[PDB]
Amino acid sequence: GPGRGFGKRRHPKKLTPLAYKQFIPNVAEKTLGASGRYEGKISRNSERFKELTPNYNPDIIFKDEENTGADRLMTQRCKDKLNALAISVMNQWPGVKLRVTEGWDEDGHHSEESLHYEGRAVDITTSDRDRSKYGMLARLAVEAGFDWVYYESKAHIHCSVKAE
Ligand SMILES: [Zn+2]
């Protein structure tokens, strides 16, 4: 084996928070190494809507500002990574949970094209809304396997996933 010192790490380095307006990987979202191409908007009255799955994780707060439960509807991959992050958030800050401020968007809040229109993007905070935490939250989102993570706003981190 590689030797002692490459076992279970007793004193791991702290992971690095991302900086305001940083994105990882450091390429455009729609590029192949990140979240790949936009396949087009999903409407409620389509059949790609039926591929979207609802996320009912009790450890995740859904703002659901629209009161439609649309924020819960996402692709399986988006659900998988979001569920992984919900675990790591609680581990990092006890008593704190992951919060989704926007998921699948039916209302065109995101320019002409957006991964929010196809259940492949969430905007997130900590449940305590302590904005000093968000650099680290965005780091946790990277390590949880989101395919692109962008510290878009002082108010949220935007995370997205590849299609399927
Ligand atoms: Zn977003």
CSV table of C-alpha atoms and ligand atoms in Angstrom, one decimal:
chain,number,residue,atom,x,y,z
A,1,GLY,CA,0.0,0.0,0.0
A,2,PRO,CA,1.0,3.6,-0.3
A,3,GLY,CA,2.3,3.7,3.2
A,4,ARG,CA,1.3,5.0,6.7
A,5,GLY,CA,0.2,8.7,6.4
A,6,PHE,CA,-2.2,7.9,3.6
A,7,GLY,CA,-4.7,6.2,5.9
A,8,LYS,CA,-7.8,7.7,7.6
A,9,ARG,CA,-6.7,11.4,8.1
A,10,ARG,CA,-6.4,12.3,11.8
A,11,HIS,CA,-6.1,16.1,11.2
A,12,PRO,CA,-7.3,16.9,7.7
A,13,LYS,CA,-6.6,20.3,6.1
A,14,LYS,CA,-9.7,22.6,6.2
A,15,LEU,CA,-11.3,22.8,2.8
A,16,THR,CA,-11.1,26.2,1.1
A,17,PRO,CA,-14.2,28.3,0.9
A,18,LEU,CA,-14.9,29.7,-2.6
A,19,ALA,CA,-14.7,33.5,-3.1
A,20,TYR,CA,-17.5,35.8,-4.2
A,21,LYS,CA,-18.2,35.3,-7.9
A,22,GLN,CA,-15.9,32.2,-8.2
A,23,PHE,CA,-17.1,29.1,-10.1
A,24,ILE,CA,-15.8,25.5,-10.0
A,25,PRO,CA,-14.8,24.0,-12.3
A,26,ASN,CA,-13.4,27.3,-13.6
A,27,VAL,CA,-15.1,27.1,-17.0
A,28,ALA,CA,-18.5,28.0,-18.3
A,29,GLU,CA,-21.4,26.1,-16.8
A,30,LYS,CA,-22.7,24.7,-20.1
A,31,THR,CA,-19.3,23.3,-21.0
A,32,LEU,CA,-18.7,19.5,-21.2
A,33,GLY,CA,-16.4,19.4,-18.1
A,34,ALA,CA,-19.0,21.3,-16.0
A,35,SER,CA,-22.8,20.7,-16.4
A,36,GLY,CA,-22.9,20.4,-20.2
A,37,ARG,CA,-25.5,21.7,-22.7
A,38,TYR,CA,-28.9,23.1,-22.0
A,39,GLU,CA,-31.6,20.8,-23.4
A,40,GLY,CA,-34.3,23.3,-23.2
A,41,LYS,CA,-37.0,24.4,-20.9
A,42,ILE,CA,-39.3,21.9,-19.2
A,43,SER,CA,-42.9,23.0,-18.8
A,44,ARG,CA,-45.5,21.4,-16.5
A,45,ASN,CA,-47.5,20.4,-19.6
A,46,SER,CA,-44.6,18.4,-21.3
A,47,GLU,CA,-43.3,14.8,-21.0
A,48,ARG,CA,-39.8,15.7,-19.9
A,49,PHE,CA,-41.7,17.1,-16.8
A,50,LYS,CA,-42.6,13.4,-16.0
A,51,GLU,CA,-38.8,12.6,-15.7
A,52,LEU,CA,-38.5,15.2,-12.8
A,53,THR,CA,-38.7,13.7,-9.3
A,54,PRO,CA,-39.9,15.4,-6.1
A,55,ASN,CA,-37.4,15.9,-3.3
A,56,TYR,CA,-39.0,15.4,0.2
A,57,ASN,CA,-35.8,15.3,2.3
A,58,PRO,CA,-36.8,16.4,5.9
A,59,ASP,CA,-33.2,17.7,6.4
A,60,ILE,CA,-33.6,20.3,3.5
A,61,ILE,CA,-35.6,23.5,3.9
A,62,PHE,CA,-37.5,24.4,0.6
A,63,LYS,CA,-38.4,28.2,0.5
A,64,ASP,CA,-41.2,27.4,-2.0
A,65,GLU,CA,-41.8,31.1,-2.5
A,66,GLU,CA,-44.3,30.3,-5.3
A,67,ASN,CA,-46.2,27.9,-3.1
A,68,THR,CA,-46.4,25.4,-6.0
A,69,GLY,CA,-43.8,23.0,-4.6
A,70,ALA,CA,-41.8,23.5,-7.9
A,71,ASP,CA,-38.6,23.9,-6.0
A,72,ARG,CA,-38.8,20.3,-5.0
A,73,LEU,CA,-39.0,19.0,-8.5
A,74,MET,CA,-35.6,18.1,-10.0
A,75,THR,CA,-33.7,15.5,-11.9
A,76,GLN,CA,-32.5,12.4,-10.1
A,77,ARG,CA,-28.9,13.5,-10.3
A,78,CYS,CA,-29.8,16.9,-8.8
A,79,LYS,CA,-31.6,15.1,-6.0
A,80,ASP,CA,-28.6,12.8,-5.4
A,81,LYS,CA,-26.1,15.6,-5.1
A,82,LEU,CA,-28.5,17.8,-3.1
A,83,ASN,CA,-29.1,14.9,-0.6
A,84,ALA,CA,-25.3,14.4,-0.3
A,85,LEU,CA,-24.9,18.1,0.5
A,86,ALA,CA,-27.7,18.0,3.1
A,87,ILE,CA,-25.6,15.4,5.0
A,88,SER,CA,-22.4,17.5,4.8
A,89,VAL,CA,-24.1,20.7,5.8
A,90,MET,CA,-25.3,19.2,9.1
A,91,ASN,CA,-21.9,17.7,9.8
A,92,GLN,CA,-20.1,21.0,9.3
A,93,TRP,CA,-22.4,23.2,11.5
A,94,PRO,CA,-24.5,21.3,14.0
A,95,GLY,CA,-28.1,22.2,14.1
A,96,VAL,CA,-27.8,24.0,10.7
A,97,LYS,CA,-29.5,22.5,7.6
A,98,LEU,CA,-29.3,23.1,3.8
A,99,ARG,CA,-31.8,25.5,2.4
A,100,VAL,CA,-33.0,25.8,-1.3
A,101,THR,CA,-34.2,29.3,-2.2
A,102,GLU,CA,-34.9,28.3,-5.8
A,103,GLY,CA,-35.0,25.1,-7.9
A,104,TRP,CA,-37.1,24.4,-11.0
A,105,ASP,CA,-38.3,27.7,-12.3
A,106,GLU,CA,-41.7,28.0,-14.2
A,107,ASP,CA,-41.5,31.8,-14.3
A,108,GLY,CA,-38.5,33.0,-16.3
A,109,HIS,CA,-36.5,34.5,-13.4
A,110,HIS,CA,-33.1,33.4,-15.0
A,111,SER,CA,-32.6,35.0,-18.4
A,112,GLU,CA,-33.5,33.4,-21.7
A,113,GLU,CA,-31.8,30.1,-20.9
A,114,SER,CA,-31.1,28.5,-17.6
A,115,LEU,CA,-30.5,25.1,-16.0
A,116,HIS,CA,-33.3,26.2,-13.5
A,117,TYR,CA,-35.7,25.6,-16.4
A,118,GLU,CA,-35.0,22.0,-16.5
A,119,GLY,CA,-34.7,20.9,-12.8
A,120,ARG,CA,-30.9,20.8,-13.1
A,121,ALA,CA,-30.0,23.8,-10.9
A,122,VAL,CA,-30.6,25.0,-7.3
A,123,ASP,CA,-29.8,28.2,-5.5
A,124,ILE,CA,-28.9,27.5,-1.9
A,125,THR,CA,-28.2,29.0,1.6
A,126,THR,CA,-27.7,27.6,5.2
A,127,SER,CA,-30.9,27.6,7.2
A,128,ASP,CA,-29.4,30.2,9.5
A,129,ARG,CA,-28.9,32.6,6.5
A,130,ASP,CA,-25.6,33.6,7.9
A,131,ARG,CA,-24.0,34.9,4.7
A,132,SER,CA,-20.4,34.5,6.0
A,133,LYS,CA,-21.0,30.7,5.7
A,134,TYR,CA,-21.7,30.7,2.0
A,135,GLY,CA,-18.1,30.4,0.7
A,136,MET,CA,-17.8,27.2,2.7
A,137,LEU,CA,-21.3,26.0,1.8
A,138,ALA,CA,-20.2,26.4,-1.9
A,139,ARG,CA,-17.1,24.3,-1.2
A,140,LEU,CA,-19.3,21.6,0.5
A,141,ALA,CA,-21.5,21.7,-2.8
A,142,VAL,CA,-18.3,21.0,-4.9
A,143,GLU,CA,-17.1,18.1,-2.7
A,144,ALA,CA,-20.7,16.7,-2.7
A,145,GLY,CA,-20.4,16.2,-6.5
A,146,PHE,CA,-22.4,19.1,-8.0
A,147,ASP,CA,-21.1,19.4,-11.6
A,148,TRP,CA,-20.8,23.2,-11.4
A,149,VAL,CA,-20.9,25.5,-8.4
A,150,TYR,CA,-21.0,29.3,-8.7
A,151,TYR,CA,-20.9,31.8,-5.8
A,152,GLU,CA,-23.3,34.0,-7.8
A,153,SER,CA,-24.7,36.3,-5.2
A,154,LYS,CA,-24.0,37.4,-1.7
A,155,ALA,CA,-27.6,36.0,-1.1
A,156,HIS,CA,-27.0,32.4,-2.5
A,157,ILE,CA,-24.8,29.8,-4.2
A,158,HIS,CA,-26.0,28.4,-7.6
A,159,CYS,CA,-25.2,24.6,-8.0
A,160,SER,CA,-26.1,22.6,-11.1
A,161,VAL,CA,-25.8,19.1,-12.6
A,162,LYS,CA,-25.2,17.3,-15.9
A,163,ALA,CA,-28.3,15.9,-17.6
A,164,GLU,CA,-29.8,12.4,-16.5
B,1,ZN,ZN,-29.3,29.6,-9.7
